[PDB]
């Protein structure tokens, strides 16, 4: 499945940085699609195409000559417009559907104790939930079958940068005789929830 | 600006001086691939993705040529207004729960990078280390600055203290993020 790219238009005739990008905003699959290209010089977007407007618009004064010229040439304006179909819709239905949109990586779930156990003394359990994809996830702590919300803290979603995520969930607790603590994880890659238990 | 998914199907970045270019695809904040502009190959972040999908690197190389040309034009057009340096910030975290004795990976996440020229290095007990080191490409941010991650393979030990060292034009002295 071949991906296709946005095509940068040619600008009209101590450090400098230029950036160009084509962004495809998908909502409910390809039912709603919005397409925006951006042209950026030293952090300032100066011209852009937006499928909601249907033509290039200058964003600042620097972009005036480009937007007018690009819009005036049918070959340039039509090729940019067509990118909503030929890039966004095409990439989603082809390559994305068989790669990104199908990736399902199961969380490793492990329970750790912060300090050495001592009955009737305060301590912390950490539920480490790691290496999962995609991002949607639910983690909950239970003590003896009842949901705990007090003394519970989760990190934000941690993006590893290698197409997996991580979330660590701490529970401040005091281990007594016979109580069992359970970390409960639900994720689209799991037919049924993962439950891991730590017996006091 | 709201969506279930965002594909960035072509990010082109060019810098002067130095003729420094980068070409990448992102989907929902992760890198699909970059195009290696010297070897002229598409390099997928996940090798399994590259077995199912493909991209012709010439699509990236021609985009880089346009953007090289546009930079020259926009530089003159703006009276050679130069880029303003930012101060990057680092965060250091392990990939897996740390267990003494067991191989793991330290990740240094560096944000607010602009311009996207940076040196990210690792210190173990203040001495240079580079085991299994890998860096991502520069990722785009909404404010047109960048972020980037570096990885270091390491064996956790209480006798070992780590630093992520970041050097950038927007920093008077190198910043060390301790872990």
């Amino acid at each position, epitope marked *: 499945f*071949e991906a296709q790219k946005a*095509k940068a*238009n*040619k600008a009209v005739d101590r450090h400098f940085v230029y950036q160009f990008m084509g962004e495809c905003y998908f909502t409910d699959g390809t039912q709603r699609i919005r397409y925006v290209t951006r042209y950026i010089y030293n952090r300032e977007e100066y011209v852009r195409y937006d499928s909601d407007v249907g033509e290039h618009r200058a964003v600042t004064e620097l972009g005036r000559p480009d937007a007018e010229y690009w819009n005036s040439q049918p070959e340039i304006l039509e*090729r940019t417009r067509a990118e909503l179909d*030929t890039v966004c819709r095409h990439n989603y239905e082809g390559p994305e559907t068989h790669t990104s949109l199908r990736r399902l990586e199961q969380p490793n779930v492990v329970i750790s104790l912060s300090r050495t156990e001592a009955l009737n003394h305060h301590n912390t359990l950490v539920c480490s939930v790691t290496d999962f994809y995609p991002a949607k996830i639910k983690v909950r702590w239970f003590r003896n079958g009842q949901e705990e919300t007090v003394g519970v803290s989760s990190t934000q979603l941690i993006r590893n940068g290698d197409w997996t995520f991580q979330v660590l969930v701490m529970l401040e607790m005091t281990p007594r005789r016979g109580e069992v603590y359970t970390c409960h994880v639900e994720h689209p890659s799991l037919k049924s929830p993962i439950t891991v238990e730590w017996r006091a | 600006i709201e969506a279930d998914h965002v594909g960035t199907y072509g990010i082109s970045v060019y810098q002067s001086p130095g003729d420094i270019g980068q070409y990448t695809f992102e989907f929902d904040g992760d890198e699909l691939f970059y195009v290696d502009l010297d070897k002229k190959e598409t390099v997928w972040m996940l090798p399994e993705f590259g077995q199912l999908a493909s991209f012709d690197p010439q699509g990236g*190389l*021609q985009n880089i*040529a*346009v953007v090289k040309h546009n930079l020259g034009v926009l530089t003159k057009r703006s009276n050679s207004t130069p880029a303003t340096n930012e101060a990057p910030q680092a965060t250091v975290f392990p990939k897996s729960p740390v267990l003494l004795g067991q191989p793991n990976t330290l990740i240094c996440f560096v944000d607010n990078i602009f311009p996207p020229v940076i040196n990210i290095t690792w210190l173990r007990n203040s001495k240079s280390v580079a085991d299994g080191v890998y860096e991502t490409s520069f990722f785009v941010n909404r404010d047109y600055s960048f972020h980037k991650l570096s990885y270091l393979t390491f064996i956790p030990s209480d006798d070992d203290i780590y630093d992520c060292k970041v050097e950038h034009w927007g920093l008077e002295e190198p910043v060390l993020k301790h872990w």
Partner: T-cell receptor
Amino acid sequence: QVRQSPQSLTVWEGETAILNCSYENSAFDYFPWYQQFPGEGPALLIAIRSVSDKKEDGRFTIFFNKREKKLSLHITDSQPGDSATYFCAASKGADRLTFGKGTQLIIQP
Amino acid sequence: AVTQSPRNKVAVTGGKVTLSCDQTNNHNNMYWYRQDTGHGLRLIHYSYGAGSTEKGDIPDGYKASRPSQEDFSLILELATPSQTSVYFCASGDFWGDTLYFGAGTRLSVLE
């Protein structure tokens, strides 16, 4: 691969000349025909995008069949001045072309 | 316009041949092709701008040079008889729907 047939075609003046082309790669989305007279370089004659099944311009028409990955250039009311070599080419993503081997057309008076 | 130079040339095997092409179209992309009966228009090398070149379908035996936006040269360092052909240069815009060809260069490489 872009394949043209026949390699050489002779047609009577006034008859419709039919030049066939086919391709392998289904991503191909742009199909320009180039006309080359003896001793000169080729020049773009007429072109079609995979979204259309027909492109007409004067005496020249392209008929395009995406499913079969087949393509045809019809020249109506052919004139001795139409004698030339005709090249079919294809593009994807507006990257570079790949030319067919060309079909030589001779119009007999 | 796209001008090729020279238009005809006889060379000896082992000889060095340079074919030069100049365009005044303000185009960014330039291309070098050969044409031979039974092979059609085969792309040898191309270029998106000064200082860079890209391989075509049949780059072997050929080096390309783009010293400026206007000029694109094809260099045959060790000419062989199989490089006997008619060569065409073309220029076009970024992503261009249209190539603009020169008039051709007849090259004979003789033992």
